[PDB]
Design a protein around this nucleic acid. Structure first.
Ligand code: MG
Ligand code: MG
Ligand code: MG
Ligand code: MG
Ligand code: MG
Ligand code: MG
Ligand code: MG
Ligand code: MG
Ligand code: MG
Ligand code: MG
Ligand code: MG
Ligand code: MG
Ligand code: MG
Ligand code: MG
Ligand code: MG
Ligand code: MG
Ligand code: MG
Ligand code: MG
Ligand code: MG
Ligand code: MG
Ligand code: MG
Ligand code: MG
Ligand code: MG
Ligand code: MG
Ligand code: MG
Ligand code: MG
Ligand code: MG
Ligand code: MG
Ligand code: MG
Ligand code: MG
Ligand code: MG
Ligand code: MG
Ligand code: MG
Ligand code: MG
Ligand code: MG
Ligand code: MG
Ligand code: MG
Ligand code: MG
Ligand code: MG
Ligand code: MG
Ligand code: MG
Ligand code: MG
Ligand code: MG
Ligand code: MG
Ligand code: MG
Ligand code: MG
Ligand code: MG
Ligand code: MG
Ligand code: MG
Ligand code: MG
Ligand code: MG
Ligand code: MG
Ligand code: MG
Ligand code: MG
Ligand code: MG
Ligand code: MG
Ligand code: MG
Ligand code: MG
Ligand code: MG
Ligand code: MG
Ligand code: MG
Ligand code: MG
Ligand code: MG
Ligand code: MG
Ligand code: MG
Ligand code: MG
Ligand code: MG
Ligand code: MG
Ligand code: MG
Ligand code: MG
Ligand code: MG
Ligand code: MG
Ligand code: MG
Ligand code: MG
Ligand code: MG
Ligand code: MG
Ligand code: MG
Ligand code: MG
Ligand code: MG
Ligand code: MG
Ligand code: MG
Ligand code: MG
Ligand code: MG
Ligand code: MG
Ligand code: MG
Ligand code: MG
Ligand code: MG
Ligand code: MG
Ligand code: MG
Ligand code: MG
Ligand code: MG
Ligand code: MG
Ligand code: MG
Ligand code: MG
Ligand code: MG
Ligand code: MG
Ligand code: MG
Ligand code: MG
Ligand code: MG
Ligand code: MG
Ligand code: MG
Ligand code: MG
Ligand code: MG
Ligand code: MG
Ligand code: MG
Ligand code: MG
Ligand code: MG
Ligand code: MG
Ligand code: MG
Ligand code: MG
Ligand code: MG
Ligand code: MG
Ligand code: MG
Ligand code: MG
Ligand code: MG
Ligand code: MG
Ligand code: MG
Ligand code: MG
Ligand code: MG
Ligand code: MG
Ligand code: MG
Ligand code: MG
Ligand code: MG
Ligand code: MG
Ligand code: MG
Ligand code: MG
Ligand code: MG
Ligand code: MG
Ligand code: MG
Ligand code: MG
Ligand code: MG
Ligand code: MG
Ligand code: MG
Ligand code: MG
Ligand code: MG
Ligand code: MG
Ligand code: MG
Ligand code: MG
Ligand code: MG
Ligand code: MG
Ligand code: MG
Ligand code: MG
Ligand code: MG
Ligand code: MG
Ligand code: MG
Ligand code: MG
Ligand code: MG
Ligand code: MG
Ligand code: MG
Ligand code: MG
Ligand code: MG
Ligand code: MG
Ligand code: MG
Ligand code: MG
Ligand code: MG
Ligand code: MG
Ligand code: MG
Ligand code: MG
Ligand code: MG
Ligand code: MG
Ligand code: MG
Ligand code: MG
Ligand code: MG
Ligand code: MG
Ligand code: MG
Ligand code: MG
Ligand code: MG
Ligand code: MG
Ligand code: MG
Ligand code: MG
Ligand code: MG
Ligand code: MG
Ligand code: MG
Ligand code: MG
Ligand code: MG
Ligand code: MG
Ligand code: MG
Ligand code: MG
Ligand code: MG
Ligand code: MG
Ligand code: MG
Ligand code: MG
Ligand code: MG
Ligand code: MG
Ligand code: MG
Ligand code: MG
Ligand code: MG
Ligand code: MG
Ligand code: MG
Ligand code: MG
Ligand code: MG
Ligand code: MG
Ligand code: MG
Ligand code: MG
Ligand code: MG
Ligand code: MG
Ligand code: MG
Ligand code: MG
Ligand code: MG
Ligand code: MG
Ligand code: MG
Ligand code: MG
Ligand code: MG
Ligand code: MG
Ligand code: MG
Ligand code: MG
Ligand code: MG
Ligand code: MG
Ligand code: MG
Ligand code: MG
Ligand code: MG
Ligand code: MG
Ligand code: MG
Ligand code: MG
Ligand code: MG
Ligand code: MG
Ligand code: MG
Ligand code: MG
Ligand code: MG
Ligand code: MG
Ligand code: MG
Ligand code: MG
Ligand code: MG
Ligand code: MG
Ligand code: MG
Ligand code: MG
Ligand code: MG
Ligand code: MG
Ligand code: MG
Ligand code: MG
Ligand code: MG
Ligand code: MG
Ligand code: MG
Ligand code: MG
Ligand code: MG
Ligand code: MG
Ligand code: MG
Ligand code: MG
Ligand code: MG
Ligand code: MG
Ligand code: MG
Ligand code: MG
Ligand code: MG
Ligand code: MG
Ligand code: MG
Ligand code: MG
Ligand code: MG
Ligand code: MG
Ligand code: MG
Ligand code: MG
Ligand code: MG
Ligand code: MG
Ligand code: MG
Ligand code: MG
Ligand code: MG
Ligand code: MG
Ligand code: MG
Ligand code: MG
Ligand code: MG
Ligand code: MG
Ligand code: MG
Ligand code: MG
Ligand code: MG
Ligand code: MG
Ligand code: MG
Ligand code: MG
Ligand code: MG
Ligand code: MG
Ligand code: MG
Ligand code: MG
Ligand code: MG
Ligand code: MG
Ligand code: MG
Ligand code: MG
Ligand code: MG
Ligand code: MG
Ligand code: MG
Ligand code: MG
Ligand code: MG
Ligand code: MG
Ligand code: MG
Ligand code: MG
Ligand code: MG
Ligand code: MG
Ligand code: MG
Ligand code: MG
Lengths: 149, 116, 202, 64
RNA sequence: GGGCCUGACUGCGAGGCCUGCAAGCCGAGCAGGGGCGAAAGCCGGGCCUAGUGAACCGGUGGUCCCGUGUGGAAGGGCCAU
RNA sequence: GGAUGACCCCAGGCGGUAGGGGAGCGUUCCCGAUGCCGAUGAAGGCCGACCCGCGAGGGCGGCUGGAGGUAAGGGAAGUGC
RNA sequence: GUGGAGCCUGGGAGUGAGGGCGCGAGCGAUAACGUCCGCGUCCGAGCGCGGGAACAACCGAGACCGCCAGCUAAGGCCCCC
RNA sequence: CUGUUGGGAAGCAGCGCCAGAGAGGGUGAAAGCCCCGUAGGCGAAAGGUGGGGGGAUAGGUGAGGGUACCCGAGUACCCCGUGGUUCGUGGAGCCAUGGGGGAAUCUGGGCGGACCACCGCCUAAGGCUAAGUACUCCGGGUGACCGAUAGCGCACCAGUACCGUGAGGGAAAGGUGAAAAGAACCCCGGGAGGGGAGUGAAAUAGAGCCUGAAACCGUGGGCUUACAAGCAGUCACGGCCCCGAGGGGUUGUGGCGUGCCUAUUGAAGCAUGAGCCGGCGACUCACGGUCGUGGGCGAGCUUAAGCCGUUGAGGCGGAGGCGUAGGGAAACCGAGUCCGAACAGGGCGCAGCGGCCGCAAAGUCCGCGGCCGUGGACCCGAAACCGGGC
RNA sequence: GGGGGGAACCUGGGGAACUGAAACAUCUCAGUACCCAGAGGAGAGGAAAGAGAAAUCGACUCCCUGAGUAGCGGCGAGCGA
């Protein structure tokens, strides 16, 4: 195979749309913008995601809800990410938070809490928390729940 | 990289100007006036092909008529008669006959008078 | 999988290794495109109407002169003004996925193998830096130079010998790359090189 | 520059698991003495936004 | 017209009217604890269609949800107005 | 029909502003290229009633010109008045 | 009833100055090339074609290209024609 | 090196040769080996530098017990007025400080977001301190950077000419030929200019010089036009002229026929723009986002800065980001959760294809495309506002 | 010893408006433009009366990430560790 035989697949590199380039292009004169108005101008309209022509916006007529919090901001507390038993089936022997960090199941600086979707496998799993059903299933399946603080 | 106009535009104007050869004043000399003249010439052309088919038929008709009234009837009666007879020689050909072959045309006249 | 010729004084033996058999023409393109694009310099520049030398004065009044209204002569509409949306410096580089590069490297070699064009050599006889020495050795291995060769070895003196040739491109094995593979009609690798090519693909 | 979350949206609204947009119902912030218990009770629930106005709001929360 | 009463309910709501949105409207039925009735049943204000104001900011009663090292507190959230 | 753009047969649709979509032409630049066209004449300029293409265009030939030009296939834009 | 029909999910719009005509009303004076609605139509975008002397919207009719062929539509058939 | 063509070899032919050098520029055309270079190497008496190597010098160095001498003052601290911080008076701390009041020296004092206690952290009111970072007047290297309307305002004697009282504004203008061989001399002319001669491969390469387009002006030739009514054309026919059952040019007669663009309900319109020609001139890029698409991997996907290598060679780097679980204001629980007394009722959530292999796919990464957000964001155009100067 | 100059870069002392909020005044533009003073091949900063929950870290500067997060906000436009 040689250099001249290198090709993108059909569809992989598509040509751009060029407006304002003659009658026959189908994009001439107004450059697909229509006639006059704010939208046709360089600069265009206000952020259509929010603005509605001056009347109170949809978003701003809805009521706020709940704690937003105050300066000095967030209150540092321990955080829990759950991982299911089904996610644990791939391992053997012992599973601990750091292992499930490596396997890319649990995110760093998060505390492990085992949840109950899936089956239980007779492992010695070490966490900071278990759900009621995960506790039963895992105790029932010959595994060994181990609690950290 | 920069792509100046360079050679391309001149070649587009020339294409047009050549097409405009023969037109009066700036119409063969200025690129802009040629293009205006050529839009007209193009719609005139298209239309006149259509119109030419009519124009000739109207001449064929006038001609058939003169050679019909030499035998005592009009085009309208003539065309009726040929129609009843089942003679399907077109007006283009009837006309050549009416001038080039007047005996043969007189015969056609005969049949049309018979057919009604 | 693939059967690769190996040159020795003990003869033309054969070597066995597993390079992918079905080769992806789009994937090799995506590697080369990337290789060649990140090498770009991005040093084309132009000046906007604010970067141009003239002043901001309104050349003549808005109304009543009988001329077109203009502001300053930095406007792109003036000959001598700034250019609209011209290039500024640009970085054409981007991070092609590592696994993609790896497959591309595998397939590139595999392609030349399927072609019967891949050749592994044990050593390089008497070539000790002089080009005419390489040419000797070349002949002994079938390299007249009717076919362009990518020579991959860690032996500097071999590279320095073979380098000035029109039909030879030279690489240390850590420099193996698919644009260089595709460019050339024949692949010639020291065993030492083939080992490190092996490490990079597994 | 990377876009900024519209905070007044973040404080009013939520993107559910499938990408619906949910808000508290309007109309019992006050003036409630003459409203029925049915008015009040129903207005305590969340509702789901019409497709068009909901699709606008999700765009203002591009990091949720 | 009279008697007894407070359903001018609490927790919900199948399903629809209307409708660009947001609103507006009608609602059987299950549960809590009641009213009238022997009962069948009716009752989530008024024969009906007007009597009204989204959000922001704050007041007030409750709740005991958060509380910036910790125990409280300050201040906020939630239900009600 | 053949079997998947090989071409053939049959049938229907094909006015069009805003605008949506599809397919192409050309200009500058990069890979192809230590190659290839080029003083037996590069580019550009002036002709042509000739050839190919629906068209944008692409050839070919004569004159001018006197040193550059650049393919198949791909890449990128200061790309068409 | 297989149609450039219909429904569902998404990407891209433009438009948010209409106008004539027919019919049904309000306004005006059983005035306006007047004004405001309803149903329809054409022009808009069919200022391409035939008829109406000439003429966007009245009548005829929806222009893919070519033909020195044929039948009709409105309207015409004394001469212009 | 020889031959051949050519004004000229570097082209073509023949036979060689170098290469750690076949990057590139030149030479009468297109040269590895003719020149300048390139690979690889060598070089400073003098001045500058010297962060590296060496050496000196300043400076640096104990443990208990006692004592309670010292440990940065209009300072800490409190109150008033402000600024800084993400913090706009907010529960408003912290750092700084214009005013007022005004300490202590370790059993002292500041901080951990009002405050208090407990528990920790830290040592205010003196000074200095490389490197890692920023910039580009200057020198060099490299371009999918420009090529004389471009590129800096200036390729040229440009911040010039010119304009302005001044601050300040601010141009135009490159090309003979390989070599001046830049045309002796004669002829017409006052000169300019030309005609010969001459040079040159070429002189419509003659210096008002490469190419030499178009508007525009002229000479010559064919056809045509003075009873004709016109968006200038077109269709038909005939005459004349040219090139050789056909074409080209011209136009007498006949038919038909309301410029282009813009803006509009509607323009030939007596509505806008345009004297004509040439060149310049308007939908882009970065980072996010959202759909679609081409591929890599897949309960996983992917690196950023940096480090190493190359000198158009790629690799490393897992910090972090997205995804794998949701519900709730939150505590919290979790295939559920929220509301509720509820095991009620609801809201928002939860569950591939074929014979272990393949195939597909969540998701994610990169390329490409449409559109959105932030930037001046399709180009041109205000009247104005503010700062510093004149 | 000082004075004065230097394209940008740096610190410090002063410090706008158009514009954005589809009006505008808090807010934005922005401590930007600009003025001034001083530095220097750099400048600033720098050896904890620090961070802030780690029972932890350990001068400062600079890049990546944290993160458009925490928060700030006529809780508007936006601002933003
Ligand atoms: Mg592209
Ligand atoms: Mg397209
Ligand atoms: Mg444009
Ligand atoms: Mg076009
Ligand atoms: Mg289109
Ligand atoms: Mg269109
Ligand atoms: Mg426009
Ligand atoms: Mg648009
Ligand atoms: Mg427009
Ligand atoms: Mg419009
Ligand atoms: Mg317009
Ligand atoms: Mg309009
Ligand atoms: Mg519009
Ligand atoms: Mg307008
Ligand atoms: Mg505009
Ligand atoms: Mg603008
Ligand atoms: Mg605007
Ligand atoms: Mg209003
Ligand atoms: Mg939050
Ligand atoms: Mg803080
Ligand atoms: Mg066990
Ligand atoms: Mg040009
Ligand atoms: Mg141009
Ligand atoms: Mg041109
Ligand atoms: Mg053109
Ligand atoms: Mg041309
Ligand atoms: Mg052309
Ligand atoms: Mg003519
Ligand atoms: Mg003329
Ligand atoms: Mg003329
Ligand atoms: Mg002319
Ligand atoms: Mg026709
Ligand atoms: Mg016609
Ligand atoms: Mg007809
Ligand atoms: Mg008669
Ligand atoms: Mg008949
Ligand atoms: Mg007939
Ligand atoms: Mg580039
Ligand atoms: Mg670039
Ligand atoms: Mg520039
Ligand atoms: Mg520029
Ligand atoms: Mg300026
Ligand atoms: Mg300037
Ligand atoms: Mg200037
Ligand atoms: Mg200036
Ligand atoms: Mg200015
Ligand atoms: Mg000004
Ligand atoms: Mg000025
Ligand atoms: Mg005026
Ligand atoms: Mg004028
Ligand atoms: Mg003028
Ligand atoms: Mg003017
Ligand atoms: Mg002006
Ligand atoms: Mg201007
Ligand atoms: Mg101006
Ligand atoms: Mg200017
Ligand atoms: Mg300007
Ligand atoms: Mg310029
Ligand atoms: Mg200039
Ligand atoms: Mg310039
Ligand atoms: Mg420009
Ligand atoms: Mg621009
Ligand atoms: Mg501009
Ligand atoms: Mg740009
Ligand atoms: Mg850059
Ligand atoms: Mg890009
Ligand atoms: Mg990059
Ligand atoms: Mg090669
Ligand atoms: Mg080579
Ligand atoms: Mg409410
Ligand atoms: Mg309210
Ligand atoms: Mg409330
Ligand atoms: Mg309240
Ligand atoms: Mg009531
Ligand atoms: Mg009630
Ligand atoms: Mg009530
Ligand atoms: Mg309630
Ligand atoms: Mg995030
Ligand atoms: Mg998430
Ligand atoms: Mg009782
Ligand atoms: Mg419902
Ligand atoms: Mg609704
Ligand atoms: Mg209502
Ligand atoms: Mg009861
Ligand atoms: Mg009872
Ligand atoms: Mg009930
Ligand atoms: Mg009543
Ligand atoms: Mg009532
Ligand atoms: Mg109400
Ligand atoms: Mg408000
Ligand atoms: Mg408001
Ligand atoms: Mg409140
Ligand atoms: Mg608590
Ligand atoms: Mg506390
Ligand atoms: Mg206590
Ligand atoms: Mg507590
Ligand atoms: Mg208490
Ligand atoms: Mg409270
Ligand atoms: Mg409280
Ligand atoms: Mg309430
Ligand atoms: Mg057909
Ligand atoms: Mg079709
Ligand atoms: Mg069409
Ligand atoms: Mg299509
Ligand atoms: Mg072009
Ligand atoms: Mg193209
Ligand atoms: Mg160029
Ligand atoms: Mg280039
Ligand atoms: Mg090349
Ligand atoms: Mg070349
Ligand atoms: Mg040749
Ligand atoms: Mg020659
Ligand atoms: Mg020639
Ligand atoms: Mg070319
Ligand atoms: Mg070129
Ligand atoms: Mg051509
Ligand atoms: Mg030529
Ligand atoms: Mg050359
Ligand atoms: Mg090319
Ligand atoms: Mg090509
Ligand atoms: Mg390629
Ligand atoms: Mg341009
Ligand atoms: Mg249709
Ligand atoms: Mg349709
Ligand atoms: Mg269908
Ligand atoms: Mg689009
Ligand atoms: Mg569009
Ligand atoms: Mg719109
Ligand atoms: Mg519109
Ligand atoms: Mg109107
Ligand atoms: Mg309207
Ligand atoms: Mg209307
Ligand atoms: Mg209508
Ligand atoms: Mg009319
Ligand atoms: Mg009638
Ligand atoms: Mg009527
Ligand atoms: Mg009415
Ligand atoms: Mg009357
Ligand atoms: Mg009207
Ligand atoms: Mg009327
Ligand atoms: Mg009327
Ligand atoms: Mg109508
Ligand atoms: Mg219109
Ligand atoms: Mg019509
Ligand atoms: Mg229509
Ligand atoms: Mg007529
Ligand atoms: Mg008509
Ligand atoms: Mg008519
Ligand atoms: Mg019509
Ligand atoms: Mg049709
Ligand atoms: Mg034919
Ligand atoms: Mg008939
Ligand atoms: Mg009739
Ligand atoms: Mg008549
Ligand atoms: Mg007649
Ligand atoms: Mg010779
Ligand atoms: Mg020779
Ligand atoms: Mg040779
Ligand atoms: Mg080299
Ligand atoms: Mg070279
Ligand atoms: Mg060279
Ligand atoms: Mg020469
Ligand atoms: Mg050559
Ligand atoms: Mg060459
Ligand atoms: Mg050379
Ligand atoms: Mg060297
Ligand atoms: Mg050297
Ligand atoms: Mg001691
Ligand atoms: Mg003491
Ligand atoms: Mg101290
Ligand atoms: Mg002191
Ligand atoms: Mg304090
Ligand atoms: Mg204070
Ligand atoms: Mg402040
Ligand atoms: Mg607050
Ligand atoms: Mg504060
Ligand atoms: Mg404190
Ligand atoms: Mg203080
Ligand atoms: Mg003070
Ligand atoms: Mg004390
Ligand atoms: Mg103490
Ligand atoms: Mg303090
Ligand atoms: Mg602290
Ligand atoms: Mg605290
Ligand atoms: Mg501390
Ligand atoms: Mg200091
Ligand atoms: Mg150091
Ligand atoms: Mg320093
Ligand atoms: Mg430094
Ligand atoms: Mg430089
Ligand atoms: Mg060039
Ligand atoms: Mg020039
Ligand atoms: Mg210039
Ligand atoms: Mg030029
Ligand atoms: Mg210069
Ligand atoms: Mg000068
Ligand atoms: Mg003056
Ligand atoms: Mg002066
Ligand atoms: Mg000035
Ligand atoms: Mg100028
Ligand atoms: Mg100049
Ligand atoms: Mg020359
Ligand atoms: Mg010269
Ligand atoms: Mg003389
Ligand atoms: Mg004389
Ligand atoms: Mg003379
Ligand atoms: Mg003379
Ligand atoms: Mg002479
Ligand atoms: Mg001679
Ligand atoms: Mg010659
Ligand atoms: Mg010539
Ligand atoms: Mg010449
Ligand atoms: Mg000249
Ligand atoms: Mg030359
Ligand atoms: Mg010349
Ligand atoms: Mg000339
Ligand atoms: Mg000329
Ligand atoms: Mg003449
Ligand atoms: Mg007469
Ligand atoms: Mg006459
Ligand atoms: Mg007339
Ligand atoms: Mg005729
Ligand atoms: Mg003729
Ligand atoms: Mg002829
Ligand atoms: Mg005529
Ligand atoms: Mg007409
Ligand atoms: Mg007319
Ligand atoms: Mg008309
Ligand atoms: Mg036009
Ligand atoms: Mg136009
Ligand atoms: Mg116009
Ligand atoms: Mg207008
Ligand atoms: Mg108008
Ligand atoms: Mg009007
Ligand atoms: Mg007119
Ligand atoms: Mg006129
Ligand atoms: Mg006017
Ligand atoms: Mg006009
Ligand atoms: Mg106007
Ligand atoms: Mg003028
Ligand atoms: Mg003219
Ligand atoms: Mg022009
Ligand atoms: Mg775009
Ligand atoms: Mg993608
Ligand atoms: Mg991959
Ligand atoms: Mg993120
Ligand atoms: Mg549930
Ligand atoms: Mg459900
Ligand atoms: Mg796959
Ligand atoms: Mg994928
Ligand atoms: Mg995209
Ligand atoms: Mg588009
Ligand atoms: Mg979009
Ligand atoms: Mg901007
Ligand atoms: Mg822009
Ligand atoms: Mg844009
Ligand atoms: Mg302006
Ligand atoms: Mg003024
Ligand atoms: Mg004012
Ligand atoms: Mg003023
Ligand atoms: Mg001033
Ligand atoms: Mg002043
Ligand atoms: Mg000084
Ligand atoms: Mg100084
Ligand atoms: Mg400052
Ligand atoms: Mg000072
Ligand atoms: Mg200040
Ligand atoms: Mg001021
Ligand atoms: Mg302001
Ligand atoms: Mg602005
Ligand atoms: Mg804005
Ligand atoms: Mg404003
Ligand atoms: Mg505004
Ligand atoms: Mg105003
Ligand atoms: Mg303002
Ligand atoms: Mg702004
Ligand atoms: Mg500020
Ligand atoms: Mg400052
Ligand atoms: Mg500045
Ligand atoms: Mg100084
Ligand atoms: Mg430095
Ligand atoms: Mg310092
Ligand atoms: Mg210290
Ligand atoms: Mg994060
Ligand atoms: Mg808010
Ligand atoms: Mg700020």
């Amino acid at each position: 195979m040689k250099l001249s035989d290198l090709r993108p697949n059909p569809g992989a590199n598509k040509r751009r749309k060029r407006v304002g380039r003659g009658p026959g292009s189908g994009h001439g004169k107004t450059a697909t913008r229509g006639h006059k108005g704010q939208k046709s101008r360089s600069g265009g309209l206000k952020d259509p995601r929010r603005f509605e022509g001056g009347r109170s916006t949809t978003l701003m007529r809805l009521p706020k809800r709940g704690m937003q919090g105050q300066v000095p901001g967030e209150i540092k507390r321990p955080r829990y990410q759950g991982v299911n038993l089904k996610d644990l089936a791939r391992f053997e022997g012992e599973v601990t938070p750091e292992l499930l960090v490596r396997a890319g199941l649990l995110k760093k600086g998060y505390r492990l809490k085992i949840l109950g979707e899936g089956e239980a496998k007779p492992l010695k799993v070490v966490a900071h928390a278990f759900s009621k059903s995960a506790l039963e299933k895992l105790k029932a399946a010959g595994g060994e729940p181990v609690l950290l603080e | 990289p920069r792509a100046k106009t360079g050679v391309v535009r001149r070649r587009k104007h020339k294409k047009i100007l050549k097409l405009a050869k023969g037109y009066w004043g700036l119409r063969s000399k200025s690129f802009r006036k040629a293009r205006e003249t050529l839009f007209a010439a193009g719609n005139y052309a298209y239309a006149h092909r259509k119109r030419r088919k009519r124009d000739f038929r109207r001449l064929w008709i006038v001609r058939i008529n003169a050679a019909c009234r030499q035998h005592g009837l009009n085009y309208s009666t003539f065309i009726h008669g040929l129609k009843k007879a089942g003679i399907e020689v077109d007006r283009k050909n009837l006309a050549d006959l009416a001038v080039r072959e007047p005996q043969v045309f007189a015969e056609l006249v005969e049949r049309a008078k018979a057919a009604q | 999988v693939y059967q690769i010729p190996v040159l020795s004084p003990s003869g033309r033996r054969e070597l066995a290794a597993d390079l992918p058999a079905e080769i992806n023409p789009h994937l090799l393109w995506e590697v080369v495109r990337w290789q060649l694009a990140k090498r770009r310099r991005g040093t084309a520049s132009t000046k906007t109407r604010g970067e141009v030398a003239y002043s901001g004065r309104k050349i003549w009044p808005q109304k009543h002169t009988g001329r077109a209204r203009h502001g300053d002569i930095g406007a792109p509409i003036f000959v001598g003004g700034g250019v609209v949306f011209g290039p500024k410096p640009r970085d054409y580089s981007y991070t092609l996925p590592k696994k993609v590069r790896k497959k591309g490297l595998a397939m590139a070699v595999a392609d030349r193998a399927r072609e019967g064009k891949l050749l592994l050599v044990e050593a390089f006889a008497g070539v000790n830096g002089k080009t005419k020495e390489f040419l000797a050795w070349a002949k002994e291995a079938g390299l007249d130079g009717s076919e362009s060769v990518l020579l991959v070895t860690g032996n500097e003196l071999v590279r320095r010998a073979a380098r000035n040739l029109p039909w030879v491109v030279t690489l240390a094995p850590e420099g193996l790359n698919v644009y260089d593979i595709v460019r050339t009609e024949r692949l010639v690798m020291d065993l030492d090189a083939w080992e490190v090519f092996q490490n990079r693909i597994g | 520059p990377k876009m900024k979350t519209h905070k007044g949206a973040k404080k009013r609204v939520k993107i559910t698991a499938s990408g619906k947009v949910v808000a508290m119902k309007t109309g019992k912030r006050h003036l409630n003495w003459q409203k029925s218990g049915k008015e009040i009770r129903q207005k305590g629930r969340k509702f789901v936004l019409a497709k068009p106005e909901a699709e606008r709001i999700k765009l203002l929360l591009p990091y949720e």
